[PDB]
Amino acid sequence: GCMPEQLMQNAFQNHSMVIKDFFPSILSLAQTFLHSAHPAVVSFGSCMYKQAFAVFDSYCQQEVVCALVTHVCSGNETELDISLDVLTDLVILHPSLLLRYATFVKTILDSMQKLNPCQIRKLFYILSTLAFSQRQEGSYIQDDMHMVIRKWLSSSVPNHKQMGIIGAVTMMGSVALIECDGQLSTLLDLVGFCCEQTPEVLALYYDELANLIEKQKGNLDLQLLDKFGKSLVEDFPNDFVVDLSPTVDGSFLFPVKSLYNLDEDETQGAIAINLLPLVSQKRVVSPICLSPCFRLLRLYTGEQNNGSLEEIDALLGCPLYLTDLEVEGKLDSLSKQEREFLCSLLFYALNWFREVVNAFCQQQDAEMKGKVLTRLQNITELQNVLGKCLAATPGYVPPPATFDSEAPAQLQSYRPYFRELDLEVFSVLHCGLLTLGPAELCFLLDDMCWKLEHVLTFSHLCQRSPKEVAVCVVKLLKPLCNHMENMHNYFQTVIPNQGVVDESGLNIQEYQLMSSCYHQLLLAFRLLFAWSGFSQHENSNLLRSALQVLADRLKPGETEFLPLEELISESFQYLLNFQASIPSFQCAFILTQVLMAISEKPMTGWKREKMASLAKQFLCQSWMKPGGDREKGSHFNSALHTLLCVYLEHTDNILKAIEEISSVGVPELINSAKDGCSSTYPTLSRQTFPVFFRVMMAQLESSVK
Amino acid sequence: MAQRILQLAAEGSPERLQEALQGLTEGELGDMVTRQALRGRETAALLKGIFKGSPCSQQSGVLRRLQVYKHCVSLVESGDLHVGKVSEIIGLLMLEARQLPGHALAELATLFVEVIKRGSLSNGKSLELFSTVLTALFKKQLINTLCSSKWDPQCVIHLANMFRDIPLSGEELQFVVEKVLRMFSKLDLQEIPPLVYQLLLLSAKGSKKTVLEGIISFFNQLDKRQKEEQATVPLDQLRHVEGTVILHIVSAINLDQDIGEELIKHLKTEQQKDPGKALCPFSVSLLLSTAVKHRLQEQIFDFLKTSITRSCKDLQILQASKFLQDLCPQQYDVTAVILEVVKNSAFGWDHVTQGLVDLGFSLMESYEPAQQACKLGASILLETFKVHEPIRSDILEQVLNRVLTKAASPVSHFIDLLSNIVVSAPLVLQNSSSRVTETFDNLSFLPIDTVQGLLRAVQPLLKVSMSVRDSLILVLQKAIFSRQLDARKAAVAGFLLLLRNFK
Known part of the structure; x- marks a missing residue:
């Protein structure tokens, strides 16, 4: 915790002359404290190397690039990534200096026996940024690049074939902005023949066409962009999805109606059900042409358009030509043609729709809004049918989806094959109350949460910034979670008595996972509002700029209100809702942790004593748990340790209440009943009294001894 | 022939191309050598043109495919084309090459340099396609009679730089070696640089022994000859050849330089005749300029030590004899070797010859x-101060504070060495005295004898300039008013009992 990087960065700003004779020291240490396994040390040493490049003489400037390249040739894993990071930083940090060590830079090019697709993209990026600089050294880089190209392209090794395309696209996009037009044309037709019989390599060409498209803003140039795209001009409408005229029969078992057919678009068209018509029965099944290629063409529609709106309208609800799949038992007594045919069809359909929304989300036209609602509805419904087929594909429903094309019946059996959800189109702060339809909060929020904790503290997901992740979360968090929590807590608190009327059709229909959605939403509040990296010059002011809209009920005050009680009081006013109807103990530990993260900063009057209120209420929350296996006894006492230790966390170790709490174990073996040595409520249980009283004896007799 | 392939197979699947060229009959290869300066991308236009006949490397194109091959691999293999078309024809070729017929692709292609390279070569581009067909899969019998069996100027680069992707070192290393001598040696300055670099990189497979022993063996034969007959010079081009073969061994020295240690002190220092192996100039110049790095102190210091030891303590123990010292062998003097290397390294082998100044101050x-x-x-440190004029100012500063701040043993060795160094210093500090003017004050705690010799040794330099003396007088005078032990006296008299005392 001492020795901040702020210091050493200062050191370079004040220790030029006093530092200059350090030359063996900075260097000979940095590679001992810049390949060592604790995140502060590595971040420090990286500050070292980069700063070293900031301050040195000629031989110093060289000694740096040499130590780098020596790391780059032979190395370890974290040293690998650190080497590339240090590099890309140096080389995109100040271009016009970092070229003098060029030919030394190249000497890795014909020894670099190490790549992942990732680092391969990286090294290509370094070499592209260098190569577009010089003339003849960029020639010889062209020699090694055509060289690695042609040798790749002829390679029959499994990694070599895709690696070729990944760097091929990589160096091309590096081209993307002498006889470079001609050499690149030679490569152009070269890649052309090189893929023109490969479908997956197709999908490489497309998808890898995408990321370079989107991650530029004014460097992708239309006269330049026209080349690689024109054969991707009509290619989607040219062959992708076969037309819809009411007599097009042929080879099929399932009658290809407009079954599952949206028709949320207009009432006249030939953007038919192209699925059965041009994919499945189509030629051999097309893995990414129908979905990833639609992604690429919608990518050209977005970036290639720059405001495109009707180019996907002309079938904006052209509904796929899968026959109505209600006979899942009408698939029973058969399999392996309709089974796998349905599996690839469901994968493709989820693809067609999820792309229709993923490119259809952030488009802010009204009829787009209604179509997106209808799409989410069809998505949930086909997801129900697809889950029924997931059970109906017990055993073999492999990932025929686009598996990123870049590598070389349960809950998680569909984690890979799904497409990639967007980066600005997970936000619609106006999905109103249902009981935004019923499942829509659960879907858009599960897609928020399944990675929103990954960034805080999939490749198109992580390509954004977690600092930008916080920036967008601050920019768009309160306007949705505010209305959601405010309605939903009291709705679950007052509808539960309506569940007492036999209203399980309201219980398992109105909010059968409405509690689960609440518990998600609370976990999101806890993960976002407390960023682990708040402890710095940025995330502290971030947490404050989030508090400045946290104030739910009443105002925050003036132009500044530095005392946090407006914060803790917005927190008490928030806890006023779900102090009435918390849906379950699984949500109990959640309400506790979410109080404890941000509402539990200071432990004092009404707050540490409020910690007394919270622990005594957590004990006071009377038990609700049916009896089965011992699953809830894995965390329902680990959470109980936090709860009792929270009532004794706001306070000290409870050598006062722990006596009757162990006496609560004396009623706790009374029967199949909770903590009941005069209590008779939760905070205890059949098996949970034993471990819980053991932990209470821990929290008392680990200190009182 | 622009309309030709693109009208036969232009429009039509089952009988268009086969018919419109069942006998197009320009040989096998009409258009691409009927329009040499063809229509832009006609190279691949016609290439898929013929490709309408059958696949690449396919047997069915006995005249079509294989004759596109015969045309390109030779005419555009050596003559004139477009360098870019010299990429394109080979591109489309390499691409189609994966689909060959399991006999129909065996061209003159096991030693079929004897088909083309043995008499027709000089353009490198064509070499890779051999790598392509080879990778398509032994046949290397022509390789046995010729790893370069006519490689006059082109069995050095071109054959190696593809011997990378499809080479064999069992006789390919050795064959490179045997060629190196007066064939490969024909290049002046290309004899060991380019082929050496390729040689090592291709060594990356292996041949630590056979690829190690030779670089220096050839180097030492060249040296023993051009010495016993009487970048540097027409008789210093040993400078360039040394600069390459060293800097290459040093740079690639990472992983297998444990093997260079292992051999070049497991062969010569085992059968003991290393005085003619483990000590040749260009065979240890590596040993102690590829050792100023980090993993080198611990082996290099110990090697040179045990060498100086066993060498001297033998080649004296027969210097008092006749009944075993005159009807008896010769001896090569390890001390004479190291003193040679100090002579030879005046040429520029900088990071090969700072291992010396370090060797001195640390032996x-x-x-x-x-x-x-x-x-x-004394010899290594002193001589290195002798010859090579830019790199000794830090030598002297290593010395002064190696021997003006220590326990009592540091009188004799370092004291005599400082005496001889400064004494041999022809005004070596005679305008560079700035380490001293803050050395001089440190002395008021030295032993009884040391303060004298420090005064005496510096006594050469005292004759120069009042910037030495006007600071000496003060940093001593201050001692006299206070405790002022014998040191103030040794100094008062030394300035007085000296010509500096005059005026």
Whole structure:
């Protein structure tokens, strides 16, 4: 915790002359404290190397690039990534200096026996940024690049074939902005023949066409962009999805109606059900042409358009030509043609729709809004049918989806094959109350949460910034979670008595996972509002700029209100809702942790004593748990340790209440009943009294001894 | 023939191309050598043109495919084309090449340089396609009679730079070696640089022994000859050849330089005749300029030590004899070797010859015959101060504070060495005295004898300039008013009992 990087960065700003004779020291240490396994040390040493490049003489400037390249040739894993990071930083940090060590830079090019697709993209990026600089050294880089190209392209090794395309696209996009037009044309037709019989390599060409498209803003140039795209001009409408005229029969078992057919678009068209018509029965099944290629063409529609709106309208609800799949038992007594045919069809359909929304989300036209609602509805419904087929594909429903094309019946059996959800189109702060339809909060929020904790503290997901992740979360968090929590807590608190009327059709229909959605939403509040990296010059002011809209009920005050009680009081006013109807103990530990993260900063009057209120209420929350296996006894006492230790966390170790709490174990073996040595409520249980009283004896007799 | 393939197979699947060229009959290869300066991308236009006949490497194109092959691999293999078309024809070729017929692709292609390279070569581009067809899969019998069996100027680069992707080192290393001598040696300055670099990289497979022993073996034959007959010079081009073969061994020295240690002190220093192997100039110049790095102190210091030791303590123990010292062998003097290397390294082998100044300051003191060893180390440090004029100013500063701040043993060795160094210093500090003017004050705690010799040794330099003396007088005078032990006296008299006392 001492020795901040702020210091050493200062050191370079004040220790030029006093530092200059350090030359063996900075260097000979940095590679001992810049390949060592604790995140502060590595971040420090990286500050070292980069700063070293900031301050040195000629031989110093060289000694740096040499130590780098020596790391780059032979190395370890974290040293690998650190080497590339240090590099890309140096080389995109100040271009016009970092070229003098060029030919030394190249000497890795014909020894670099190490790549992942990732680092391969990286090294290509370094070499592209260098190569577009010089003339003849960029020639010889062209020699090694055509060289690695042609040798790749002829390679029959499994990694070599895709690696070729990944760097091929990589160096091309590096081209993307002498006889470079001609050499690149030679490569152009070269890649052309090189893929023109490969479908997956197709999908490489497309998808890898995408990321370079989107991650530029004014460097992708239309006269330049026209080349690689024109054969991707009509290619989607040219062959992708076969037309819809009411007599097009042929080879099929399932009658290809407009079954599952949206028709949320207009009432006249030939953007038919192209699925059965041009994919499945189509030629051999097309893995990414129908979905990833639609992604690429919608990518050209977005970036290639720059405001495109009707180019996907002309079938904006052209509904796929899968026959109505209600006979899942009408698939029973058969399999392996309709089974796998349905599996690839469901994968493709989820693809067609999820792309229709993923490119259809952030488009802010009204009829787009209604179509997106209808799409989410069809998505949930086909997801129900697809889950029924997931059970109906017990055993073999492999990932025929686009598996990123870049590598070389349960809950998680569909984690890979799904497409990639967007980066600005997970936000619609106006999905109103249902009981935004019923499942829509659960879907858009599960897609928020399944990675929103990954960034805080999939490749198109992580390509954004977690600092930008916080920036967008601050920019768009309160306007949705505010209305959601405010309605939903009291709705679950007052509808539960309506569940007492036999209203399980309201219980398992109105909010059968409405509690689960609440518990998600609370976990999101806890993960976002407390960023682990708040402890710095940025995330502290971030947490404050989030508090400045946290104030739910009443105002925050003036132009500044530095005392946090407006914060803790917005927190008490928030806890006023779900102090009435918390849906379950699984949500109990959640309400506790979410109080404890941000509402539990200071432990004092009404707050540490409020910690007394919270622990005594957590004990006071009377038990609700049916009896089965011992699953809830894995965390329902680990959470109980936090709860009792929270009532004794706001306070000290409870050598006062722990006596009757162990006496609560004396009623706790009374029967199949909770903590009941005069209590008779939760905070205890059949098996949970034993471990819980053991932990209470821990929290008392680990200190009182 | 622009309409030709694109009208036969232009429009039509089953009988269009086969018919419109069932006998197009320009040989096998009409258009691409009927329009040499063809229509832009016609190279691949016609290439898929013929490709309408059948696949690449396919047997069915007995005249079509294989004759596109015969045309390109030779005419555009050596003559004139477009360098870019010299990429394109080979591109489309390499691409189609995966689909060959399991006999129909065996061209003159096991030693079929004897088909093309043995008499027709000089353009490198064509070499890769051999790699392509080879990778398509032994046939290397022509390789046995010729790893370069006519490689006059083009069995050095071109054959190697593809011997990378599809080479064999069992006779390919050795064959490179045997070629190196007066064929490969024909290049002046290309004899060991380019082929050496390729040689090592191709060594990356292996051949630590056979690829190690030769670089220096050839180097040492060249040296022993051009010495016993009487970048540097027409007789210093040993400078360039040394600069390459060293800097290459040093740079690639990472992973297998444990093997260079292992051999070049497991062969010569085992059968003991290493005085003619483990000590040649260009065979240890590596040993102690590829050792100023980090993993090198611990092996290089010990090697040179045990060498100086066993060498001297033998080649004296037969210097008192006749009944075993005159009807008896010769001896090559390891001391004479190291003293040679100090002579030869005046040419520029900079990071090959700072291992010396380090060798001096870290043997000629701390070494401890034993007295003979220290006596030797005087030579390395002193001579290195002798010859190569830019790199010794830091030598002297290593010395002064190696021997003006220590326990009592540091009188003799380092004291005599400082005496001889400054004494041989022809005004070596005679305008560079700025380490001293803050050395001088440190002395008021030295032993009884040391303060004298420090005064005496510096006594050469005192004759120069009042910037030495006007600061000496003060940093001593201050001692007299206070405790002022014998040191103020040794100094008062030394300035007085000296010509500096006059005026």
